[PDB]
């Protein structure tokens, strides 16, 4: 709950951002901020693919617990993701539409991750 | 072996490319092309992190076997990776230095993956 201001900041800064969330390695979502605004595209196709990535996101996210791995992406045709470690139990995930700014997404999540880590 | 011309094309096109390889889900490398040329940076630190990503790359690569997942990245401070599925048994991996062109890497691997798939 202390996180949501940071999750909202990520979505606000990244063109095409669907959602920014904290997720547990136990597969239980902790907090989210979702794109509320009328997008310049129809995002329902993206929401379908994002739902269909959730199992695989948490599987790939496990690699973040290794010292060397700092960032993981699991991407579909319509949806890109960026994930970073926030604690031994939690990771941060940004989902954006494939036509969004993936470079800005990676940069903004790198800047925001320490702020989320500080709220634990 | 029919692949290597395609692996060389990827490394030649992407600034900061360390290597482009075909790897089995059995954890056995099939073919590679490595950056031979004198880089504008010292890449030994990157080679160390790339070695330390190998276990986790193959773990995250498993997600490519799902219908929805088309592309996976497992990144360190010094090394970025992009992976795509080439067959039920094999995936394609591009590793580049963190200061390389990640956007171009993703684009070139997407263009090259079908050419590698055609050589099976
Ligand atoms: Na890590
Ligand atoms: Na797939």
Author numbering:
A (entry chain A), B (entry chain A): 1 to 120
Provide the authors' own sentences about this structure as they appear in the paper.
Mutual gliding motility protein C (MglC), a paralog of GTPase-activating protein Mutual gliding motility protein B (MglB), is a member of the polarity module involved in regulating motility. MglC is required for polarity reversal and interacts with MglB and RomR. The crystal structure revealed that, despite sharing <9% sequence identity, both MglB and MglC adopt a Regulatory Light Chain 7 family fold. Using isothermal titration calorimetry and size-exclusion chromatography, we show that MglC binds MglB in 2:4 stoichiometry with submicromolar range dissociation constant.
There was no good structural template to use as a model for solving structure using molecular replacement. The closest homologue available at RCSB PDB shared ∼8% sequence identity. So, we solved the crystal structure using Selenomethionine Single-wavelength anomalous diffraction (Se-SAD) experimental phasing technique at 1.85 Å resolution. MglC crystallized in P6522 space group (a = 96.69 Å, b = 96.69 Å, c = 58.28 Å, α = 90°, β = 90°, γ = 120°) with one molecule in an asymmetric unit. The final refined model contains all 120 residues of MglC. The crystal structure revealed the typical RLC7 fold (α1β1β2α2β3α3). MglC monomer contains five antiparallel β-strands sandwiched between three α-helices. We also observed an electron density for a metal ion in the crystal structure having a square pyramidal geometry. We placed Na+ which is coordinated by two water molecules and main chain oxygen atoms of L64, T66, and V69. The native and Se-SAD structures superpose well with r.m.s.d. of 0.144.
